[PDB]
Amino acid sequence: AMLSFEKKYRVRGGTLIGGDLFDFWVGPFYVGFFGVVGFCFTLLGVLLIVWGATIGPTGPTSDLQTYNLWRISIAPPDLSYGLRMAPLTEGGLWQIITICAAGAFISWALREVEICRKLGIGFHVPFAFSFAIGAYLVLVFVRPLLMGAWGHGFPYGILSHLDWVSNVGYQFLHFHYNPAHMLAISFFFTNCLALSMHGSLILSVTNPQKGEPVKTSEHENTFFRDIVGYSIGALAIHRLGLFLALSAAFWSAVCILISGPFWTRGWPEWWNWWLELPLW
């Protein structure tokens, strides 16, 4: 089925790879070459996750195997394997799922580019999705490579990856003092504030008080000038929201990338360059 206004946009072409071969929809989904390619990566990765849950860390007969949703964990190899492929039951399964995940993500983004070409719209969304992919690849590719072992990746488990985050963080004693981490968090918080402000404002002028007509661009600008003496503007709030969300992802990737590869001591002690300036 199609949205009642959709048929007049379902045009042939705009593919990057594949042309007419895969140029079709399946229900709502556009497929194309990267839909097929992404589907294979995705279905394989998910089924290898279920297979990893089925055999557990030490075989399906041990007390450690579990289908409990919180406890399932597929883990990377020991650091001793370095940049080599571990045996499937010793972290190699995690490594293959990682390659599947990256391919699924990147194929998803290129499918999005083909959709933009069909619709004649800007490429902001696949560009923005690339920042999330970049952060994932810093976590499983750039940072592990710089330290010399794929085993620095995080495990694929709903709660087990929180244990990874905790223990990597406290390797630096007090990870809160990571300067790129402070900046990234500031962007995450500011983004959430900005999103609630934006959502609120659009809903409050299109759903005004009873008896009122729909409000105007002049109301939107007046409302925040009245509260903070400034209005960024209806176009610019979307510029701002995109800037804050991408900055949050970017400084995230930076903050984990420097943790190990470019800094090994506690994070509070980094700030000693400031304390030690010959000014005070």
Ligand X SMILES: CCCCCC/C=C\CCCCCCCCCC(=O)O[C@H](COC(=O)CCCCCCCCCCCCCCC)COP(=O)(O)OC[C@@H](O)CO
Ligand Y SMILES: CCCCCCCCCCCCCCCCCC(=O)OC[C@H](COP(=O)([O-])OCC(O)COP(=O)([O-])OC[C@@H](COC(=O)CCCCCCCCCCCCCCCCC)OC(=O)CCCCCCCCCCCCCCCCC)OC(=O)CCCCCCCCCCCCCCCCC
Among 23, 53, 140, 180, the residue binding other proteins under the rule CB under 8 A is 23
Element housing 201 (H / E): helix 179-206
Among 36, 88, 92, 129, the residue binding ligand BPH under the rule CB under 6 A is 129
The answer to whether residue 91 forms part of the interface with other proteins (CB under 8 A) is: yes
The string of DSSP codes covering 131-161 is HHHHHHHIIIIIHHHHHT-GGGSPPEETTHH
Q: Is-contact 156 73, C-beta < 8 A? A: yes
Is position 161 annotated in a ligand binding site? yes
The torsion defined by the Cα of 89, 95, 100 and 103, in degrees rounded to 10, comes to -170
Site string for other proteins, 26-45 (x = CB under 8 A): xxxxx---------------
The string of DSSP codes covering 231-264 is ---TTHHHHHHHHHHHHHHHHHHHHHHTTTTS--
Taking CB under 6 A as the binding criterion, the range among 5-13, 40-48, 113-121, 143-151 that sits at the site for ligand BPH is 40-48
Residue 230's binding partner, choosing from ligand PEF, ligand BCL, ligand X, none, with beta-carbon cut-off 5 to 8 A by kind? ligand X
Among 228, 235, 275, 279, the residue binding ligand X under the rule CB under 6 A is 228
Is position 152 annotated in a ligand binding site? no
The answer to whether residue 266 forms part of the interface with other proteins (CB under 8 A) is: yes
Judged by beta carbon, residue 54 or residue 171, the one nearer other proteins is 171
Residue 165's binding partner, choosing from ligand BCL, ligand Y, ligand PEF, none, with beta-carbon cut-off 5 to 8 A by kind? ligand BCL
N-terminal to C-terminal alpha carbon distance within the chain: 70
Contacts (CB under 8 A) with other proteins, residues 96-155 = 108, 111-112, 114-125, 127-129, 131-132, 146-149, 151-152, 154-155
Site string for ligand PEF, 205-224 (x = CB under 6 A): --x-----------------
Please count the other Cβ atoms lying within 10 Å of the Cβ belonging to residue 28.
9
Q: How far is Cα 267 from Cα 170, in angstroms, rounded to an integer? A: 10
Nearest CA to 97 among 111, 80, 85? 85
Is position 40 annotated in a ligand binding site? no
Residue 255's binding partner, choosing from ligand Y, ligand BCL, ligand BPH, none, with beta-carbon cut-off 5 to 8 A by kind? ligand BCL
61 three-class SS: coil
Among 120, 211, 229, 278, the residue binding ligand X under the rule CB under 6 A is 229
Nearest CA to 151 among 26, 143, 117? 143
- Residue 95 CB burial class (10 angstroms; 0-12, 13-18, ≥19): buried
Residues that bind ligand PEF (CB under 6 A): 203, 207
* Residue numbers belonging to the annotated binding site: 161, 175-176, 181, 198, 231-233, 238, 255
